[PDB]
Symmetry: C3
Subunit: 149 residues, 3 copies
């Protein structure tokens, strides 16, 4: 009977795993995830870049990254205020790279930016109208995470 | 060892079932579900009717169907823009049925609607008024899913 | 082999426990939970105090309790209307206590409140502007639950 109980339990587990996946899909849906698109979410908390990266990492997501105008607008409507994007030029000044790998393709810089102000600005925030401004990674901005499509 | 381990994993499984049930109750509450009332949810995406049904079906819900004046208003409250209802006359033109089966009971059609205008209209949408209008199941309108009371 | 399958089941269970914890963390985050702080949620339903206690209790939370001005404003923003707080003087008239134990410290009473009006008022509501007013526990106000930091 032991092997039977085990098989029945593996069946329960398979069912439970599917149920949890459904819970995740309904949650993503209720928070705006569009079909076939990445899911963007925020708690409206402002913190230094390293903390945003750590936070999204803990949720198994990454710092929000706009790969085109549509995604940029999506992030813009989720944030409501200045928010960090998963982009920095920490390696080579002026060479923005995604924190998940690869050179920046789509960009939406504000007039006169990036300007690597004062002691330097190697992080990026999306601001008003959805435009971009480089800022200090130590500055506190809104944490917005993204999850895969 | 073996039998005690198996017995404990059965209890772990049941504990996980209880927690997931609790998680689902909390999510429904946060989504606005009122006690002993069905609730509606949307990701604010606009799409063809066939996609709305498939999407809600996957989430184990159905395309929102107002059974009375109250519910019809709750959906309107959630949608905010034209949204598909789980009603169509695809089977027999003129005869609208619920996607869940059965013939129409309560309704709230707009004046001189449904009319099956143009090349035809077999789906139904709730407008920024609560009134209903048949439209092309191919047109794109907001997806609003409904879940059991 | 039996022992192999059992060890796999343990791994599956531990994986499921991890994923559910992540689902809970992401949901809290999506609900505005700030790092190291408790969060608040409401379904916007109005009901007597005993019903709110039972509802929050079931979700493994408690009726919202503002411990300082920051928390008070967060609860105010979530409520958007009059809502019960986890504070009452049901046990000893005039001495407000937290439903979870302990005498009231931080408070935000409107002028001339609390006043135990009429036959008496032993519960507390936060109002539109964030100030507090004692009311009848039998009155119906918005249900707002709080969850631990
Ligand atoms: O050093 C931060 C930032 O300062 C300046 O931009 C300002 C900020 O974006 C924020 O305060 O909003 C202001 C009004 O829109 C804006 O001037 C610039 O020097 C910018 O380059 C710099 O990163
Ligand atoms: O074919 C769609 C629909 O078109 C006409 O109604 C219009 C639509 O409901 C929508 O575009 O909003 C318009 C006003 O805001 C409205 O006139 C009608 O021909 C209707 O019968 C038809 O279903
Ligand atoms: O705002 C004061 C008081 O208002 C409500 O009670 C009412 C007042 O005592 C007064 O208007 O008389 C009414 C009965 O005639 C009574 O309901 C309550 O909200 C109370 O809690 C509050 O202190
Ligand atoms: Ca630099
Ligand atoms: Ca720089
Ligand atoms: Ca700058
Ligand atoms: Ca037809
Ligand atoms: Ca038709
Ligand atoms: Ca029509
Ligand atoms: Ca009393
Ligand atoms: Ca009293
Ligand atoms: Ca009072
Ligand atoms: Cl920097
Ligand atoms: Cl059609
Ligand atoms: Cl009372």
């Amino acid at each position: 009977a032991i092997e039977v109980k085990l098989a029945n339990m593996e069946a329960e587990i398979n069912t439970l795993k599917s149920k949890l996946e459904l819970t995740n899909k309904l949650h993503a849906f209720s928070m705006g995830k569009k079909s076939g698109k990445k899911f963007f979410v925020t708690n409206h908390e402002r913190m230094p870049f390293s903390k945003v990266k750590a936070l999204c990492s803990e949720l198994r997501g990454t710092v929000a990254i706009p790969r085109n105008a549509e995604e940029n607008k999506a992030i813009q409507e989720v944030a409501k205020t200045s928010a960090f994007l998963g982009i920095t030029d920490e390696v080579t000044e002026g060479q923005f790279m995604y924190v998940t790998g690869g050179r920046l393709t789509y960009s939406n810089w504000k007039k006169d930016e990036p300007n690597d102000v004062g002691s330097g600005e190697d992080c990026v925030t999306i601001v008003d109208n959805g435009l971009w401004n480089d800022v200090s990674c130590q500055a506190s901005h809104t944490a917005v995470c993204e999850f895969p499509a």
